[PDB]
């Protein structure tokens, strides 16, 4: 009887865990019909892990659960079924997403200010500190204040989209039309922007 896989679908597209619950991911491979399963990461056999747990079904399907997900866990995870063996490949990629949020116009001691917060979620890498930039604009001027937000090491874990971590804050003082434009925060090789517009 020919052995085939009904899941996961045959694809080379990247696969990412849902960032609302990014601490764990379950990868399941199932046979088309009613087995022994082997799991590999880049062709290397995965018991000894304690964050990679493999559980068979009550044998037509096998599931690999990765707990304590961190950015370094990204790789090609393959499930091989046998009674020619059939192998399915999951290209598990772990994104880092930057988000720049604005407080809007805020009055501080009679002066209007705007506070932009650089937030991240997903799987931080701790490879590049947050950096603020703005085209045609010197952010080292007196009208701007940059306040880093010192957080714990995030590269060993994950950050849920429901609980975003603020990394830095840029405050613009005495808002005028000349302050309009894009403000970008770049973290860990990723970036996000917010456009200040008084219109
Ligand atoms: C096992 O093999 C894995 C695959 O290896 C690749 O394929 C083989 C055939 C070889 O050619 C090998 O050289 C290839 O790398 C391998 O996993 C791969 O690791 C690389 C490097 O870590 C990953 O590249 C990075 O991926 C992340 C994640 O992308 C997602 O998130 C971003 C947003 O954050 C989205 O935009 C994407 O669409 C994805 O949703 C990227 O963020 C990252 O980009 C940043 O870094 C690069 C390089 O520094 C910069 O140029 C960019 O501008 C960004 O700053 C990289 O693209 C690759 O995704 C990953 N492939 C997988 C998991 O399939 C793994 O390392 C090998 N070893 C082990 C032990 O697993
Ligand atoms: C904003 O305007 C107030 C009032 O004129 C002034 O006291 C304050 O120093 C100004 N802020 C900056 C950053 O120049």
Residue 163: phi and psi, rounded to 5, are -135, 85
Ligand with an atom nearest the CA of residue 128 = 1
> Do residues 170 and 156 share a domain?
yes
Residue nearest to atom 1 of ligand 2 (CA): 174
The experimental method is X-ray
> Do residues 101 and 84 share a domain?
no
Whole-number Å distance between alpha carbons of 113 and 69: 38
Q: What is the CATH number of the domain that holds 102?
A: 2.60.40.10
DSSP letter at 160 equals: -
Which of 35, 67, 34, 37 has the alpha carbon at shortest distance from 50?
A: 67
Spatial contact of 19 and 93, defined as CB atoms under 8 Å apart: no
CA 155 to chain centre: 11
Whole-number Å distance between alpha carbons of 178 and 175: 8
> Do residues 150 and 182 share a domain?
yes
Whole-number Å distance between alpha carbons of 25 and 186: 27
> Do residues 71 and 119 share a domain?
no
The Å distance, Cα 175 to ligand 1 centre, comes to 41
Spatial contact of 191 and 160, defined as CB atoms under 8 Å apart: no
> Do residues 26 and 103 share a domain?
no
Breaks, C-N > 2.5 A, in the chain lie after 34, 46, 58, 83
**Nearest atom of ligand 1 to the alpha carbon of 189:** 55
Ligand with an atom nearest the CA of residue 107 = 2
Q: Which domain holds residue 76?
A: 5-92
Residue nearest to atom 63 of ligand 1 (CA): 75
> Do residues 17 and 85 share a domain?
yes
Spatial contact of 29 and 5, defined as CB atoms under 8 Å apart: yes
> Do residues 136 and 53 share a domain?
no
Ligand with an atom nearest the CA of residue 11 = 1
Which of 66, 77, 119, 74 has the alpha carbon at shortest distance from 94?
A: 74
> Do residues 87 and 119 share a domain?
no
Give buried/exposed letters for 31-48 (b at 16+ CB in 10 A, else e): beeeeebebbbeeeebee
> Do residues 69 and 10 share a domain?
yes
Residues with CB under 6 A from ligand 1: 14, 16, 41-42, 74-76, 91-93, 95-96, 189-190
The Å distance, Cα 93 to ligand 1 centre, comes to 7
Last residue of a domain, one of 71, 92, 113: 92
The full DSSP string for 162-186 is TS-EEEEEEEEES--GGG-EEEEEE
> Do residues 103 and 123 share a domain?
yes
The Å distance, Cα 170 to ligand 1 centre, comes to 30
């Amino acid at each position: 009887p020919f052995l085939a896989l009904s899941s996961p679908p045959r694809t080379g597209l990247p696969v990412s865990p849902d960032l609302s619950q990014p601490h764990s991911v379950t990868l399941t491979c199932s046979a088309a019909s009613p087995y022994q399963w082997q799991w590999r990461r880049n062709g290397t056999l995965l018991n000894t892990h304690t964050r990679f747990s493999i559980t068979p079904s009550t044998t037509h399907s096998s599931s690999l659960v990765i707990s304590g997900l961190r950015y370094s866990d990204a790789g090609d995870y393959m499930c091989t079924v046998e009674y020619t063996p059939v192998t399915g490949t999951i290209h598990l990629e772990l994104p880092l997403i930057v988000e720049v949020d604005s407080s809007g116009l805020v009055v501080r001691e009679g002066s209007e200010v705007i506070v932009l917060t650089c937030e991240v979620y997903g799987y931080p890498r701790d490879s590049s500190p947050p950096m603020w930039s703005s085209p045609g604009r010197n952010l080292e001027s007196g009208r701007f204040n940059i306040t880093p937000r010192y957080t714990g090491t995030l590269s060993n874990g994950s950050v849920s989209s429901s609980d975003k971590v603020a990394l830095s804050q840029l405050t613009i003082f005495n808002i005028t039309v000349a302050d309009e434009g894009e403000y970008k925060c770049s973290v860990d090789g990723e970036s996000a922007s917010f456009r200040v517009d008084l219109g």
